[PDB]
Design an enzyme around this catalytic site. Sequence first.
Site, PDB file in Angstrom:
ATOM      1  CE  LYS A  34      66.465  85.379  92.483  1.00  0.00           C
ATOM      2  NZ  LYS A  34      67.906  85.220  92.136  1.00  0.00           N
ATOM      3  CG  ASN A  60      63.437  82.083  94.706  1.00  0.00           C
ATOM      4  OD1 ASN A  60      63.205  80.894  94.449  1.00  0.00           O
ATOM      5  ND2 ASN A  60      64.668  82.586  94.724  1.00  0.00           N
ATOM      6  CG  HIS A  93      69.382  78.465  88.067  1.00  0.00           C
ATOM      7  ND1 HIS A  93      69.285  77.633  89.157  1.00  0.00           N
ATOM      8  CD2 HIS A  93      69.278  79.726  88.556  1.00  0.00           C
ATOM      9  CE1 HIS A  93      69.124  78.383  90.249  1.00  0.00           C
ATOM     10  NE2 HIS A  93      69.123  79.671  89.949  1.00  0.00           N
TER      11      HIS A  93
HETATM   12  C1  UMA Z   1      64.172  74.949  93.846  1.00  0.00           C
HETATM   13  C2  UMA Z   1      63.240  76.103  94.143  1.00  0.00           C
HETATM   14  O1  UMA Z   1      62.813  76.804  93.217  1.00  0.00           O
HETATM   15  N1  UMA Z   1      62.971  76.358  95.422  1.00  0.00           N
HETATM   16  C3  UMA Z   1      61.977  77.363  95.769  1.00  0.00           C
HETATM   17  C4  UMA Z   1      60.655  76.688  96.111  1.00  0.00           C
HETATM   18  O2  UMA Z   1      60.818  75.849  97.268  1.00  0.00           O
HETATM   19  P1  UMA Z   1      60.072  74.411  97.248  1.00  0.00           P
HETATM   20  O3  UMA Z   1      60.388  73.743  98.528  1.00  0.00           O
HETATM   21  O4  UMA Z   1      58.666  74.634  96.822  1.00  0.00           O
HETATM   22  O5  UMA Z   1      60.893  73.723  96.071  1.00  0.00           O
HETATM   23  P2  UMA Z   1      60.462  72.574  95.013  1.00  0.00           P
HETATM   24  O6  UMA Z   1      59.946  73.214  93.792  1.00  0.00           O
HETATM   25  O7  UMA Z   1      59.625  71.605  95.719  1.00  0.00           O
HETATM   26  O8  UMA Z   1      61.853  71.988  94.616  1.00  0.00           O
HETATM   27  C5  UMA Z   1      62.891  71.735  95.573  1.00  0.00           C
HETATM   28  C6  UMA Z   1      63.670  70.487  95.163  1.00  0.00           C
HETATM   29  O9  UMA Z   1      62.828  69.315  95.245  1.00  0.00           O
HETATM   30  C7  UMA Z   1      63.164  68.429  94.193  1.00  0.00           C
HETATM   31  N2  UMA Z   1      61.988  67.963  93.476  1.00  0.00           N
HETATM   32  C8  UMA Z   1      60.818  68.708  93.357  1.00  0.00           C
HETATM   33  C9  UMA Z   1      59.681  68.146  92.898  1.00  0.00           C
HETATM   34  C10 UMA Z   1      59.696  66.764  92.468  1.00  0.00           C
HETATM   35  O10 UMA Z   1      58.752  66.147  92.000  1.00  0.00           O
HETATM   36  N3  UMA Z   1      60.897  66.110  92.576  1.00  0.00           N
HETATM   37  C11 UMA Z   1      62.055  66.627  93.089  1.00  0.00           C
HETATM   38  O11 UMA Z   1      63.060  65.934  93.220  1.00  0.00           O
HETATM   39  C12 UMA Z   1      64.158  69.090  93.261  1.00  0.00           C
HETATM   40  O12 UMA Z   1      65.475  68.619  93.763  1.00  0.00           O
HETATM   41  C13 UMA Z   1      64.004  70.531  93.687  1.00  0.00           C
HETATM   42  O13 UMA Z   1      65.269  71.155  93.674  1.00  0.00           O
HETATM   43  O14 UMA Z   1      59.657  77.679  96.403  1.00  0.00           O
HETATM   44  C14 UMA Z   1      60.003  78.527  97.543  1.00  0.00           C
HETATM   45  C15 UMA Z   1      58.843  79.494  97.731  1.00  0.00           C
HETATM   46  O15 UMA Z   1      58.559  80.185  96.521  1.00  0.00           O
HETATM   47  C16 UMA Z   1      61.315  79.230  97.270  1.00  0.00           C
HETATM   48  O16 UMA Z   1      61.684  80.017  98.390  1.00  0.00           O
HETATM   49  C17 UMA Z   1      62.401  78.201  96.981  1.00  0.00           C
HETATM   50  O17 UMA Z   1      63.623  78.912  96.699  1.00  0.00           O
HETATM   51  C18 UMA Z   1      64.979  78.547  97.068  1.00  0.00           C
HETATM   52  C19 UMA Z   1      65.480  79.287  98.295  1.00  0.00           C
HETATM   53  C20 UMA Z   1      65.892  78.176  95.936  1.00  0.00           C
HETATM   54  O18 UMA Z   1      66.878  77.451  96.112  1.00  0.00           O
HETATM   55  N4  UMA Z   1      65.538  78.697  94.764  1.00  0.00           N
HETATM   56  C21 UMA Z   1      66.410  78.717  93.592  1.00  0.00           C
HETATM   57  C22 UMA Z   1      65.580  78.653  92.320  1.00  0.00           C
HETATM   58  C23 UMA Z   1      67.388  79.905  93.542  1.00  0.00           C
HETATM   59  O19 UMA Z   1      67.192  80.880  94.319  1.00  0.00           O
HETATM   60  O20 UMA Z   1      68.300  79.899  92.676  1.00  0.00           O
HETATM   61  N1  ADP Z   2      73.870  92.817  92.654  1.00  0.00           N
HETATM   62  C1  ADP Z   2      74.665  91.799  93.022  1.00  0.00           C
HETATM   63  N2  ADP Z   2      75.627  91.263  92.250  1.00  0.00           N
HETATM   64  C2  ADP Z   2      76.428  90.227  92.628  1.00  0.00           C
HETATM   65  N3  ADP Z   2      76.355  89.598  93.822  1.00  0.00           N
HETATM   66  C3  ADP Z   2      75.389  90.130  94.612  1.00  0.00           C
HETATM   67  C4  ADP Z   2      74.530  91.182  94.324  1.00  0.00           C
HETATM   68  N4  ADP Z   2      73.666  91.452  95.376  1.00  0.00           N
HETATM   69  C5  ADP Z   2      74.028  90.549  96.262  1.00  0.00           C
HETATM   70  N5  ADP Z   2      75.064  89.723  95.879  1.00  0.00           N
HETATM   71  C6  ADP Z   2      75.404  88.439  96.523  1.00  0.00           C
HETATM   72  O1  ADP Z   2      74.439  87.518  95.963  1.00  0.00           O
HETATM   73  C7  ADP Z   2      74.362  86.382  96.821  1.00  0.00           C
HETATM   74  C8  ADP Z   2      72.887  86.169  97.181  1.00  0.00           C
HETATM   75  O2  ADP Z   2      72.311  87.462  97.558  1.00  0.00           O
HETATM   76  P1  ADP Z   2      70.694  87.617  97.610  1.00  0.00           P
HETATM   77  O3  ADP Z   2      70.308  88.960  98.030  1.00  0.00           O
HETATM   78  O4  ADP Z   2      70.175  86.615  98.544  1.00  0.00           O
HETATM   79  O5  ADP Z   2      70.312  87.339  96.059  1.00  0.00           O
HETATM   80  P2  ADP Z   2      69.327  86.176  95.420  1.00  0.00           P
HETATM   81  O6  ADP Z   2      68.051  86.274  96.109  1.00  0.00           O
HETATM   82  O7  ADP Z   2      69.240  86.617  94.081  1.00  0.00           O
HETATM   83  O8  ADP Z   2      70.052  84.893  95.505  1.00  0.00           O
HETATM   84  C9  ADP Z   2      75.055  86.680  98.149  1.00  0.00           C
HETATM   85  O9  ADP Z   2      76.359  86.075  98.101  1.00  0.00           O
HETATM   86  C10 ADP Z   2      75.312  88.239  98.050  1.00  0.00           C
HETATM   87  O10 ADP Z   2      76.453  88.826  98.682  1.00  0.00           O
HETATM   88 MG    MG Z   3      66.936  84.893  97.162  1.00  0.00          MG
HETATM   89 MG    MG Z   4      68.963  81.092  91.507  1.00  0.00          MG
END
Ligand code: UMA
Ligand code: ADP
Ligand code: MG
Ligand code: MG
Length: 429
Positions: A115, A138, A183
């Site tokens: 993504k 995200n 997830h």
């Molecule tokens: C967990 C999640 O979805 N994180 C995304 C979120 O960041 P933000 O800091 O707002 O997160 P949040 O929703 O407050 O949650 C973060 C953590 O806080 C904790 N949490 C949250 C609320 C609460 O009442 N209690 C609690 O314990 C949970 O452990 C949760 O994991 O909003 C940001 C802006 O949109 C995103 O960049 C960020 O992505 C990250 C990088 C991520 O790890 N995302 C997951 C979903 C992924 O990519 O797989």
């Molecule tokens: N199309 C794909 N399939 C599998 N792995 C991928 C793909 N594109 C990137 N990767 C790997 O996915 C992981 C996260 O990449 P990223 O671009 O940040 O994706 P996301 O935002 O979905 O987590 C990194 O380890 C990267 O090398």
């Molecule tokens: Mg990402």
């Molecule tokens: Mg994810």
Amino acid sequence: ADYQGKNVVIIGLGLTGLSCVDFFLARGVTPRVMDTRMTPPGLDKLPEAVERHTGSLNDEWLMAADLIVASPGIALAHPSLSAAADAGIEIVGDIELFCREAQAPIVAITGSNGKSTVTTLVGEMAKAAGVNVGVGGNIGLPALMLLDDECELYVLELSSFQLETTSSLQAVAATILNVTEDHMDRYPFGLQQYRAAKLRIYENAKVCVVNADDALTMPERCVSFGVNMGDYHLNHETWLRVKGEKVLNVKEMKLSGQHNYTNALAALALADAAGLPRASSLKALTTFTGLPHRFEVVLEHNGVRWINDSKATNVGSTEAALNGLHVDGTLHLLLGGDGKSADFSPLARYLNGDNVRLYCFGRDGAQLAALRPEVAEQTETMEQAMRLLAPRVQPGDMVLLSPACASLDQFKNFEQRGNEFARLAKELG
Ligand SMILES: CC(=O)N[C@H]1[C@@H](OP(=O)(O)OP(=O)(O)OC[C@H]2O[C@@H](n3ccc(=O)[nH]c3=O)[C@H](O)[C@@H]2O)O[C@H](CO)[C@@H](O)[C@@H]1O[C@H](C)C(=O)N[C@@H](C)C(=O)O
Ligand SMILES: Nc1ncnc2c1ncn2[C@@H]1O[C@H](COP(=O)(O)OP(=O)(O)O)[C@@H](O)[C@H]1O
Ligand SMILES: [Mg+2]
Ligand SMILES: [Mg+2]
């Protein structure tokens, strides 16, 4: 939309919750905020005027609310939130609030992997066209902070969590890049429930960009990308091809790896659908060097490459790192963190032979060491694992952080693990 005089409750004091606080305050609406943690990250940054409840969810506040704005990190299935839903109380997320306001087309991108890479690529294609583009979601920049009357295009990275609470998205072009187990700790009804969350992205999308090689990405609006088949596909020198013609020899790209070539195809399909000029989009594909922490070489010294793939947070991304990986000596592979209830056993087939050593850490370290215990060591932390492996590294070896897990069990924010690996590799390599 109109929120005047409504009782608004925000759940989560992280990036998203704070951006929602600012959004409502700038409209003359003072929300209340709650977080299940006693000291969430954004607590210090909260305006004094805003009432807050920490250490649990407050059901008095939830059941009194006109609107509940849930951060993506809290499940809709939380009992307190299901009680509010049952009572007919509206629940949305920040992406929903954003869509109601946005005055430019939105390109929307989800999928289990890739993504951020595809989001950033489409952003670069828009910049190469001179288009005023807002890139967020995200990726780590809260979407509500993009809103700008000058913005001509929005590109949003959307998680399955964000998509669950979004109902008003009408993307000009949307994609699910791929769907592989991730997830699972948030989807008790399994891979199909997880998929269903991502399928929401196509609702009312003008164009759907699907993965020809991944049937779970399927929702006539559909344009496909793939390796050997698709409207956008590869032909192997490897060329990107679009509907019967060569558009780019991938030798011109800075990225490599088949999954990055199909990332480029998906980005091109989205850009084409959003109306961006083909020529400048192709130029962007050749300038983009890759995001930090996505299979990123951070050090090549004394015959050893240290590779930061900290953003590999599930089995699919670590498989992509390992499959067909060339190492002249020994691979020292770092795994661990929060495994989100994943089945790690698909990794096992890559871990045979005399040239691989595993260093497993964090919450689910033992589960990862069990993949092949005879070549595995377990530590509590990543730094301990790095200091353990550093003496063993020989010329020709590779040190790969590709952990197949989230970092949240030990790391404070979403960049910290990758930053720490870089710093320790520089120290130790
Ligand atoms: C967990 C999640 O979805 N994180 C995304 C979120 O960041 P933000 O800091 O707002 O997160 P949040 O929703 O407050 O949650 C973060 C953590 O806080 C904790 N949490 C949250 C609320 C609460 O009442 N209690 C609690 O314990 C949970 O452990 C949760 O994991 O909003 C940001 C802006 O949109 C995103 O960049 C960020 O992505 C990250 C990088 C991520 O790890 N995302 C997951 C979903 C992924 O990519 O797989
Ligand atoms: N199309 C794909 N399939 C599998 N792995 C991928 C793909 N594109 C990137 N990767 C790997 O996915 C992981 C996260 O990449 P990223 O671009 O940040 O994706 P996301 O935002 O979905 O987590 C990194 O380890 C990267 O090398
Ligand atoms: Mg990402
Ligand atoms: Mg994810």
